[PDB]
Amino acid sequence: PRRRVIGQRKILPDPKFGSELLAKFVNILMVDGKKSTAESIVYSALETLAQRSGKSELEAFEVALENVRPTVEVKSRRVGGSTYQVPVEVRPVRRNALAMRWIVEAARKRGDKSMALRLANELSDAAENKGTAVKKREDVHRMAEANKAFA
Amino acid sequence: IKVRENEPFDVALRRFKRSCEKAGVLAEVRRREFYEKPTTERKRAKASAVKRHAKKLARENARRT
Amino acid sequence: FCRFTAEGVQEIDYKDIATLKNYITESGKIVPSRITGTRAKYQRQLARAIKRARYLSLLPYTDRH
Amino acid sequence: RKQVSDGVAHIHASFNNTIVTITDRQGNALGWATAGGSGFRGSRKSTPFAAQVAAERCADAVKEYGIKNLEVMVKGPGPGRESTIRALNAAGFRITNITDVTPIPHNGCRPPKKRR
RNA sequence: AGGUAAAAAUGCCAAG
RNA sequence: GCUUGAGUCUCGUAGAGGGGGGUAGAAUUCCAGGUGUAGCGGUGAAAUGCGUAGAGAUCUGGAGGAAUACCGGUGGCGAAGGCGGCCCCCUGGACGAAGACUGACGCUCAGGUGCGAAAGCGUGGGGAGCAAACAGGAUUAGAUACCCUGGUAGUCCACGCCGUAAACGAUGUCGACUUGGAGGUUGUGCCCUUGAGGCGUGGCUUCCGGAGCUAACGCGUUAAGUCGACCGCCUGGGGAGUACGGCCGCAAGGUUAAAACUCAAAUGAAUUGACGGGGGCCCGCACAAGCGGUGGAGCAUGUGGUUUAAUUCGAUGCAACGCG
């Protein structure tokens, strides 16, 4: 705000398989604090995909992650006379922030029959750059090109 | 005004414009005669010249810098 | 801030066009004595000699014709 | 059609107006379009982003002439001055240069007194 | 050190 | 009579000082046409208007009036008003260096006289742009205004007239005398011009401050300090710089200039508090960035508005409306 820049906490490694990045998927999927249900659905997803694709477990969050890789977006500099968009350099935390956010926009919509149903598919869908997740970054890109070659 | 920095500018790099008289000067002789607001304005303009001049040399106390 | 003529005593001609061009910017505009920090009496010899050059088109009034 | 392969985008980007004029080096008009033509009723046609897109609707109609390169001349401070060139640096044109041909007078065309 | 920038729709009036 | 006052000459000095005559370039306005064409132009939002009878825009050529970007600088010159594109002809003043000469030839000044911003007036031209008047369109409770668009005299040149302005560093003219600093601007003398300088001196000159002065603010070797000479002038505000009379003017008016009557104040300086459709910086989920509701719908319920013989009433920007 106008004062001290706050920081972070001690985010717990996953008590199934120690890992922090995916722990925010819980956070970026949590609704009304239903952890066990998330523990039910979030878990259901990865192991079946690990089982379905054939690779390791913690390289499944990665396989999808390749083609959903974002780098930038817009953060407009509307000084008060120029609301022209200005693209932003999406920093790591800022990067992974919208990252686990793209798993949201993709999965929450077009509810087939179950969360783990779509989530697992979207992962490997994201792994071949032909699904919702991967383009979720692409769409962002085409509203940034608007302005090029600035100083 | 005339910028064509051989080949590799490829961007604005139009300081040649902004440094001399870019439209701000057009936006200086815009629309009004007065004859005199500037007559008065130059006097007040220069007024700042000496006082701000003092600010650099009248800042010479301790002030715990 | 060239200590030009406070120690360079002579009359400023327009014929020395090489020396003359050193006082006009690329956009034609003649540059003030403030930046060059030389004497106005001496700088006075400049502007009139400029128009002499300007009148003969030896230099430009303003390049965009 | 004569199919000329070079041209010039004059731009009349005034305080509250912006018109783009892509002609050749002989003054014959090749292709013209404006932010005004984009509709953008009154106030709203004064935005830099507006002129950028209008240039997108202006980068055409010269491709039909075999246009290759071009130089930009803009006038009027207002918005723009770069908005269009940004949309022109990438409009699909090997741009040579950009110049400001603004009419600097020498004190004597009496200017209006409005706006009190 | 240091110099441009910036909006200007409209709204009046009082006995202890 | 003399000369320390004052006045002129010899040699240089920078400057928009002034009168007049030619001339350059940018820019706008307009004409002619080419290309090309649905807009141009406007702003608080427009609308008026200009437009397919083909403008805007853009380009070549041409027709014009008018002022001079940059330089440019509490930079310079002038009695003030004031004056700068360039070029030339006529021509004023002010300052410096060492002597020459004259030998108080001074200062101020009723009346008189000359100059004297703009607007304005007369006569003949000119008439880009701008623009009183003006009309159309907006705004407004009204808006014979502020704003948009056209648009007239004027603005501009010549020859006369008007003689007033916040013609104001709001400070008369002239001379002497009484701490310094920062400079600036413009000539000059001495020294190693060893270098854009060091050490003095002439003028104009901007700011800061000593004593002093002042009611204070502030001024302060550029005095509002310390004296002297001379002159214009003041006597509460209003009435009134108005009337009448004189003079001056084509007119506008200008100038010299009351009284009756009315009030117990009008007035300057300063700083507290207040206000600001004034700001400089900081601060709160004030917003950003995000999480997730309300605004759709049903129903609970309040309030308003309605309706009712009666449907108690208070609370109603923020700080009332699932409140009493």
From Swiss-Prot, chain A:
Its biological purpose is as follows: One of the primary rRNA binding proteins, it binds directly to 16S rRNA where it nucleates assembly of the head domain of the 30S subunit. Is located at the subunit interface close to the decoding center, where it has been shown to contact mRNA. Has been shown to contact tRNA in both the P and E sites; it probably blocks exit of the E site tRNA.
Task: Answer whether the UniProt record assigns the keyword Acetylation to this protein.
Answer: no
User: What result follows from mutating residue 35 to A/E?
Assistant: Defective in ribosome assembly
| tRNA-binding found in the keyword field | yes
What does the entry list under GO cellular component? Answer: cytoplasm; cytosol; cytosolic small ribosomal subunit; membrane; ribosome
- Name the consequence of residue 115 to G: Significantly decreases affinity for its own mRNA
Keywords, in A-Z order: Ribonucleoprotein, Ribosomal protein, RNA-binding, rRNA-binding, tRNA-binding
What are the protein's GO molecular function terms? Answer: mRNA binding; rRNA binding; structural constituent of ribosome; tRNA binding
Give the protein family.
Belongs to the universal ribosomal protein uS7 family.
Quaternary data: Part of the 30S ribosomal subunit. Contacts proteins S9 and S11. Cross-links to IF3 and the P and E site tRNAs.
Q: Quote additional remarks.
A: The strain K12 sequence is shown. Has been predicted to contact the N-terminal domain of IF-3 based on footprint studies; exactly how IF-3 interacts with the 30S subunit is controversial.
State the name under which the record lists this protein. Small ribosomal subunit protein uS7
Organism name:
Escherichia coli (strain K12)
- The domain of life is Bacteria
Swiss-Prot record, chain B:
Q: Which Pfam families match?
A: Ribosomal_S21
Sorted alphabetically, which InterPro entries does this protein's record hold? Answer: Ribosomal_bS21, Ribosomal_bS21_CS, Ribosomal_bS21_sf
Q: Which residues form a coiled coil?
A: none
Q: Name one GO molecular function term.
A: rRNA binding
Q: Where is this region: Disordered?
A: 40-65
Q: What does this protein do?
A: Probbly involved in recognition of ribosome rescue factor SmrB in stalled/collided disomes; fusion of protein fragments to its N-terminus decreases ribosome rescue in the presence of SmrB.
According to UniProt, the name of this protein is Small ribosomal subunit protein bS21
What Gene Ontology terms describe where this protein resides (cellular component)?
cytoplasm; cytosol; cytosolic small ribosomal subunit
NCBIfam families found in the cross-reference section: S21p
What biological processes does GO assign it? cytoplasmic translation; ribosomal small subunit assembly
How does this polypeptide assemble, per the annotation?
Answer: Part of the 30S ribosomal subunit. In stalled ribosomes contacts ribosome rescue factor SmrB.
Its keywords, alphabetically, are: Ribonucleoprotein, Ribosomal protein, RNA-binding, rRNA-binding
Q: Where is the composition biased (Basic residues)?
A: 43-56
UniProtKB/Swiss-Prot annotation, chain C:
* One term of GO molecular function: mRNA 5'-UTR binding
Q: Is this entry keyworded Glycoprotein?
A: no
Keyword annotations for this protein, in alphabetical order, are: Acetylation, Ribonucleoprotein, Ribosomal protein, RNA-binding, rRNA-binding
Instruction: Please name every pair of cysteines joined by a disulfide bond in this record.
Output: none
Q: Return the similarity comment.
A: Belongs to the bacterial ribosomal protein bS18 family.
**HAMAP family, per the entry:** Ribosomal_bS18 (MF_00270)
Question: What is the name of this protein?
Answer: Small ribosomal subunit protein bS18
UniProtKB/Swiss-Prot annotation, chain D:
Q: Which NCBIfam families match?
A: PRK05309.1 (NF003698), uS11_bact (TIGR03632)
The terms under GO molecular function for this entry are: small ribosomal subunit rRNA binding; structural constituent of ribosome
Keywords from UniProt, A to Z, are: Methylation, Ribonucleoprotein, Ribosomal protein, RNA-binding, rRNA-binding
Q: Does Signal count among this protein's keywords?
A: no
Q: How does it assemble?
A: Part of the 30S ribosomal subunit. Interacts with proteins uS7 and bS18. Cross-links to IF-3. In stalled ribosomes contacts ribosome rescue factor SmrB.
Additional detail? Has been predicted to contact the N-terminal domain of IF-3 based on footprint studies; exactly how IF-3 interacts with the 30S subunit is controversial.
Q: Output the Gene3D superfamilies linked to this UniProt entry.
A: Ribosomal protein S11
Quote the protein name from its UniProt record.
Small ribosomal subunit protein uS11
Described by its record, this protein's role is as follows: Located on the platform of the 30S subunit, it bridges several disparate RNA helices of the 16S rRNA. Forms part of the Shine-Dalgarno cleft in the 70S ribosome.
